Amino acid sequence: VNSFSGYLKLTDNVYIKNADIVEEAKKVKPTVVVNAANVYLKHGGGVAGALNKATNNAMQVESDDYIATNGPLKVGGSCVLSGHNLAKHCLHVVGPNVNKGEDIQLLKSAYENFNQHEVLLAPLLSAGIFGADPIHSLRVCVDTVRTNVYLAVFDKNLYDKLVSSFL
Ligand SMILES: O=C(NO)c1ccccc1O
């Protein structure tokens, strides 16, 4: 049994809810919240900008030190950093950004990072300002992630379309 409430069950392991991931993290304090990161961990807008704002910029400060030591992530890669006031840990995952021309086949590699964590609160990778089709992102998630994933969908209209169209 876990703390997550009000989710629709899509599969054995994938759950979905219309919710602001920031407000959901603040309520649940999950072991892992996933950030929709870029390779520079520059948390400017969307999931990354909203999560970072909720940490009062502490996520960005920690991220800048990580990049100064380790250099950029790979598209499809991830790193584990602090969850600050939102979660125990933040898994920063880089999905491909279609608005930069990145290979959408890298979306499966991105979701494979989730399998290193038994339970996660996450957004749909490569959705929103990353430019991918969120219906596709949800299909890759279901077909890739084997651990228990609680997906927060920021937009109500999109949430209803994701549920109604789910195979
Ligand atoms: O932009 C946002 N503002 O809150 C946001 C918040 C939660 C999830 C995705 C988002 O884009």
From Swiss-Prot:
<comment type="function">
    <text>Responsible for the cleavages located at the N-terminus of the replicase polyprotein. Participates together with nsp4 in the assembly of virally-induced cytoplasmic double-membrane vesicles necessary for viral replication. Antagonizes innate immune induction of type I interferon by blocking the phosphorylation, dimerization and subsequent nuclear translocation of host IRF3. Also prevents host NF-kappa-B signaling. In addition, PL-PRO possesses a deubiquitinating/deISGylating activity and processes both 'Lys-48'- and 'Lys-63'-linked polyubiquitin chains from cellular substrates.</text>
</comment>
<protein>
    <recommendedName>
        <fullName>Papain-like protease nsp3</fullName>
    </recommendedName>
</protein>
<feature type="domain" description="Macro 1">
    <location>
        <begin position="1"/>
        <end position="167"/>
    </location>
</feature>
<comment type="subunit">
    <text>May form homohexamers. Interacts with N protein.</text>
</comment>
